[PDB]
Design a protein around this ligand. Structure first.
Ligand SMILES: Nc1ncnc2c1ncn2[C@@H]1O[C@H](COP(=O)(O)OP(=O)(O)O)[C@@H](O)[C@H]1O
Ligand SMILES: Nc1ncnc2c1ncn2[C@@H]1O[C@H](COP(=O)(O)OP(=O)(O)O)[C@@H](O)[C@H]1O
Ligand SMILES: Nc1ncnc2c1ncn2[C@@H]1O[C@H](COP(=O)(O)OS(=O)(=O)O)[C@@H](O)C1O
Ligand SMILES: Nc1ncnc2c1ncn2[C@@H]1O[C@H](COP(=O)(O)OS(=O)(=O)O)[C@@H](O)[C@H]1O
Lengths: 195, 195
């Protein structure tokens, strides 16, 4: 195939190979989707080609045959990681917004990127469970409490807090714009995004 | 998310939204890999960001848990189609080089692109089986004849020749450059590649 260095010439304007994955992780309703969109607008506004993977374009498409059992969440996250690696390798900034509950799966995603020489930035989107449940963006928390959903992350299945993420976004203690700026700063420090 | 039309400005220096999938189909050794590489080179050399999906980057990753039974080749091609659609939606020209033996799965790939308003070009890379077997690029035909591979398309499983492909490339009757030109011409007529 054509090399990353050639792809760096034609992907976008700025030149340079800037493929990587921004990997958002955290509780349902903690803010992954919001941050991923606002990051995406920042990136396009600054002429860095990017793409957002989330449940909307993954879960009822590539992964529509997956549910929420531990084996299925692990396949979900495995397939996502492989596809993300393909977008990073194509030279885009790939932003993922899956709860991705289990440390093991996140570290496997990272390993698949590192083996391929692609930067992987794990971003802990950290809000308290009670705050996520009070946001109840989609009404899942109220259904899970009522027993209509089981295996629901945060209530009757575990979220394993990232021990060593590249950034922690405290979404109950700061604005969307501050959270984005924290990630952008990281991409600046890694020459992915111009100052 | 950010709109297709905004993302189209930012993916490359040629303006305009050029996301689409060039879907190559045909027998092992018919010439999919060769055409896809030369097409990728044409696009990158003309400053159009593109990406190639093939067995090398899909089958031992995303689709590493899939084999060659008819159901597995059908799941293989479905997942492939969904990811291709994701690259088209990001604004890249996505080139796939899977044998993809079954018409039903190919037409499902098309439908998944068309439903999303993304161009899908099915490209029949057509050489006679005997010619493919004489090329035996990777030694698959000699292994299949010896019974070490089963279900090997063309020998003990069917290839269903495309009835309405957008182009037919007779790779035994013309050069790589003529065949590529047939595809490039199609992309010009489809406003994917400027005149
Ligand atoms: N700093 C912040 N980051 C992300 N979301 C925030 C923040 N502050 C408030 N919110 C609100 O919390 C909700 C986050 O939900 P969502 O982004 O759908 O979460 P997730 O994708 O992790 O399920 C949104 O309604 C958003 O407006
Ligand atoms: N017009 C043509 N188009 C494509 N390949 C050709 C052509 N003429 C000769 N070939 C040769 O045919 C072989 C096809 O191998 P490959 O492209 O790997 O097939 P596939 O990807 O379909 O398995 C290559 O060695 C290539 O050089
Ligand atoms: N039994 C088989 N039939 C066809 N291809 C096989 C078989 N076993 C292994 N392969 C291989 O299939 C790879 C391509 O398969 P695709 O993944 O292109 O097949 S498809 O039928 O699911 O679209 C070849 O590179 C290759 O060697
Ligand atoms: N049982 C559940 N556990 C966690 N999330 C669920 C569950 N059921 C539905 N969902 C949800 O489905 C989406 C979460 O999907 P993912 O982010 O893909 O989860 S993950 O664990 O496999 O990484 C959210 O809409 C969401 O709250």
């Amino acid at each position: 195939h054509v090399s990353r260095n050639k792809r760096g010439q034609v992907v976008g304007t700025r030149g340079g190979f800037r493929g990587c994955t921004v990997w958002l992780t955290g509780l349902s309703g903690a803010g992954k989707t919001t941050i991923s969109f606002a990051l995406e607008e920042y990136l396009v506004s600054h002429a860095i080609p990017c793409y957002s993977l989330d449940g909307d374009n993954v879960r009822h498409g590539l992964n529509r045959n997956l549910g929420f059992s531990p084996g299925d969440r692990e396949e979900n996250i495995r397939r996502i990681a492989e596809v993300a690696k393909l977008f990073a390798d194509a030279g885009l900034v790939c932003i993922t917004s899956f709860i991705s509950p289990f440390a093991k799966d996140r570290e496997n995603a990272r390993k698949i990127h590192e083996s391929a020489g692609l930067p992987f930035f794990e971003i802990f989107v950290d809000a308290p469970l009670n705050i996520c449940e009070s946001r109840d963006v989609k009404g899942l928390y109220k259904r899970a409490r009522a027993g209509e959903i089981k295996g629901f992350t945060g209530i009757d299945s575990d979220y394993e807090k990232p021990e060593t993420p590249e950034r922690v976004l405290k979404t109950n203690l700061s604005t969307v714009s501050d959270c984005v700026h924290q990630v952008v700063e990281l991409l600046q420090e890694q020459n992915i995004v111009p100052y």
